[PDB]
């Protein structure tokens, strides 16, 4: 009675979840745009009506691809640069005590040593200023990395400034974007569009604080894979940014030492004037208001009468125990202890100053056996940035006490990329379809 | 006639529309299927896309629907695959829901189409022999 | 190129003539002065600016033809 027959259609709008490899789109830098395609001046977006999709920020392969690409670019940038093999020698060091304050005592060492020259039968005697974090006693010292591995020096022409990067999918695939505000990264998204590729994402590297990021359009957003489990980090996205001003005030000097044929080592000659600690400033009232918003949002998941505490970091490496970042080529590690120190109970112009340190031997990613020596920057340096989120961890959490304490976290860089690619996913089209129809061939 | 805008459904715009309405824009979807270490991955992706396109075209040609976007066939519709009538399929459903429903009865239909087309080719040859 | 040919219904053919009428605005010359007094390069140079609209017309015409064929076979 039905007398229906199979009929084939090619080009039906159907898709399935899939994994693939996306490519560049961008408008001397470590993040090489030379091997990246130009971007379209007028990106196109198609809003899909009546399409409700499923999203999960904690199972996105784009984060893994971004991490791999960033690591590969960082490795590639350092290949054509000098290797500081001859720098593992016996240094003879002395304390620097010329116009120093009470908090910069012992931080700097004036170290002299012997070095090779362009002719392989000659030696020279030179000296440089090193940081206490870089030299370990063997009045004789050695560089910290000498017993682990020899490692290279960043070329002084490449810039560390992040540049936006867009990720565009191949043919036969599509990128779906969730336009639903208040979307907490997991679950169903009623409102969806299709994009050729994503907004410009700056690969900013930092810990304990998200800088130069994107802001929630409505209010503070809290995200966690399993908020009941205390072993999972909590990503907080601010509604408004908090300005932070960091500075190294020492008037540094740079000198070049020829260590071979066409090979130079950039040493810190001397410091002009006084010697003082680098530091950062953040407004007090703005931080208090932001923490008020954060605790108000946290009360939603952890009860309405719970006491919410902010405390110091637990411990570990300097990278994870401190807010670590890079300001114009100099690598800062700073003590965010005046920020996360307070308790909240259910019911002018001064600023918080974070004093902090600088380093030159860097293990950027969580790897052992590869350094990166940062040449000194000449003159005073200052920078300003926006804080637009936090990475928190809940300690303990047992039912014995009704007080919840949160501490800063970080270390893993995948959490930094996850905060930007939370509303995107990749699918692959399935154009072949079959239906009942009343013809017959 | 002035102060009026014109907009066309683009690419996957008909995803949420019914099957009958979505079947009027197959060309926009069809046209989009075709178009040192990183170069290897990019080229691998391109080769994979080409291979997928060629596989789909080969299947279409094997079923005798070569060069057609809509091609109705001779295979009868078994009621076991689905019981819904045309009223509740082409005006009250979308292609994604249909794919979800019929995802477990796909290969047998393909085999039936292949065998049917082989039979038609043999019969056509026999007819032309006379 | 093969996909473009197939979408117009000219699959598997080198000379495939279609149903779209020839708008006089594209070219006013008659067949006598085209097929016997000109070359393909000159013609391509002449009509290089009226190409995409013809492609769209061919696409829509083939879609309509397929729909009509399906409707005819429905009976």
């Amino acid at each position, epitope marked *: 009675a039905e007398n229906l027959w199979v009929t084939v259609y090619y080009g039906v709008p159907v898709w399935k979840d899939a994994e693939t490899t996306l490519f560049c789109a961008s408008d001397h830098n470590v993040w090489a745009t030379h091997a990246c395609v130009p971007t379209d001046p007028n990106p196109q977006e198609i*809003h899909l009506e009546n399409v409700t999709e499923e999203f999960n920020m904690w199972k996105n392969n784009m984060v893994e691809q971004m991490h791999t690409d960033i690591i590969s670019l960082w490795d590639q940038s350092l290949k054509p640069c000098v290797k500081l093999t001859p720098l593992c020698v016996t240094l003879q060091c002395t304390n620097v005590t010329n116009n120093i304050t009470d908090d910069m005592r012992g931080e700097l060492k004036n170290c002299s040593f012997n070095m090779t020259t362009e002719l392989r039968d000659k030696k020279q005697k030179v000296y440089s200023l090193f940081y206490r974090l870089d030299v370990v006693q063997i009045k004789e010292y050695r560089l910290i990395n000498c017993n682990t591995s020899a490692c290279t020096q960043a070329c002084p022409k490449v810039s560390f400034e992040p540049i936006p990067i867009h990720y565009c999918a191949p043919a036969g695939f599509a990128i779906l974007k969730c336009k639903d505000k208040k979307f907490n990264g997991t679950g169903p998204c009623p409102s969806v569009s299709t994009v050729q590729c994503t907004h410009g994402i700056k690969p900013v590297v930092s810990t304990q604080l998200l800088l130069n990021g994107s802001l929630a359009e409505e209010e503070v957003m809290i995200r966690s894979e399993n908020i009941t489990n205390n072993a999972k980090n909590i990503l907080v996205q601010f509604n408004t940014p908090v300005q932070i001003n960091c500075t190294r005030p020492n008037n540094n000097t740079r000198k070049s030492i020829r260590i071979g044929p066409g090979q130079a080592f950039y040493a810190t000659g001397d410091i002009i004037g006084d010697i003082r600690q680098a530091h950062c400033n953040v407004s007090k009232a703005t931080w208090n208001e932001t923490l008020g918003k954060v605790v108000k949002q946290l009360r939603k998941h952890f009860g309405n009468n719970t006491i919410i505490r902010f405390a110091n970091s637990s411990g570990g490496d300097l990278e994870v125990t401190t807010h670590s970042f890079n300001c114009g080529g100099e690598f800062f590690y700073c003590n965010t202890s005046g920020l996360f120190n307070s308790t909240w109970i259910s019911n002018s112009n001064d600023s918080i100053t974070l004093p902090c340190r600088i380093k030159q031997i860097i293990n950027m990613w969580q790897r052992i056996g590869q350094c990166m020596y940062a040449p000194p920057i000449q003159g005073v340096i200052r920078c300003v940035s926006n804080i637009t989120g936090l990475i928190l961890t809940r300690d303990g959490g047992s039912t014995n006490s009704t007080t919840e304490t949160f501490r800063p976290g970080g270390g893993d860089m995948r959490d930094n990329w996850r905060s930007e690619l939370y509303k995107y996913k990749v699918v692959k089209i399935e154009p072949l379809g079959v239906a009942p129809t009343r013809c017959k061939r | 006639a*002035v*102060g009026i805008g014109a*907009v066309f459904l683009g690419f996957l715009g008909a995803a949420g529309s019914t099957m009958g309405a979505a079947s009027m824009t197959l060309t926009v979807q069809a046209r989009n299927l075709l178009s040192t270490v990183w170069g290897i991955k990019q080229l691998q992706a391109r080769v994979l896309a080409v291979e997928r396109y060629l596989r789909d075209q080969q299947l279409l040609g094997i079923w005798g629907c070569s060069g057609k976007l809509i091609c109705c066939t001779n295979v009868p519709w078994n009621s076991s695959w689905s019981n819904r009538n045309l009223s509740e399929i082409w005006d009250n459903m979308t292609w994604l829901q249909w794919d979800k429903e019929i995802s477990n009865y796909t290969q047998i239909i393909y085999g039936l189409l292949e065998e049917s087309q082989n039979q038609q080719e043999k019969n056509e040859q026999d007819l032309l022999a006379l | 190129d093969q996909q473009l040919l197939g979408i117009w219904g000219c699959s598997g053919k080198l000379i495939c003539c279609t149903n779209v009428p020839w708008n006089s605005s594209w070219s006013n010359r008659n067949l006598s002065e085209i097929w016997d007094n000109m070359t393909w390069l000159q013609w391509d140079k002449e009509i290089s600016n009226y190409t995409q609209i013809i492609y769209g017309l061919l696409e829509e015409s083939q879609n309509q033809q397929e729909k009509n064929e399906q409707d005819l076979l429905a009976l």
Partner: antibody
Amino acid sequence: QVQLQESGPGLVKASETLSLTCAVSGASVSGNYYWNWIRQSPGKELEWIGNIHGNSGTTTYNPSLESRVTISTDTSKNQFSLKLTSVTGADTATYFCATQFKKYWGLSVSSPFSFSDSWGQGVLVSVSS
Amino acid sequence: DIQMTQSPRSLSASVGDRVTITCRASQDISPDLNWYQQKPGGPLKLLIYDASNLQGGVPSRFSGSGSGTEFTLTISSLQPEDFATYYCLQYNGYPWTFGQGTKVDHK
């Protein structure tokens, strides 16, 4: 579906410039759309202020208010704004942002028809001497 | 400018009564005319587009007819939610001019 929301100051002084904004969701300002600004004073007839083409930027204002109306678009914020200079007592009214278009379900302008329109909730503005 | 005259300016009718509203333009604008409905203190709802096509979602009781310089909106069976101000609008040529608004209330 396209949704529109209006915003701006609820009170303005005489001879000042009234600035209103309309934010659109579900569509792009740069698309082929005609974004419309209209007003209705209390107990009177609707008065169309002006319009702008999203893609081309061409603006057409009412001849009566052609010398005091300026309509612009912000793609980054996905909105469009109206500026009315030298506001007076007669300018007190409820202002609406709107957009109407034709959605075609096929290819080229021949295939069926679907007329769509969207009007915002509107914002009441009063001019004080 | 194309001027519009809408009649009756004010009408009173009961539930279930047939309501007719006429709108006339200074010059031929056919078929470019739309009919909208506006409740007190709310946005306008599009009832008819092109003067003969019922907008999607509108109840079938509303209808439109006419051409040239005379268009008519008809409510076959008035309902409690139908008491509102009805307007006729054109888009053939600028400026876009609305009608004075026919107000239908409960008798």
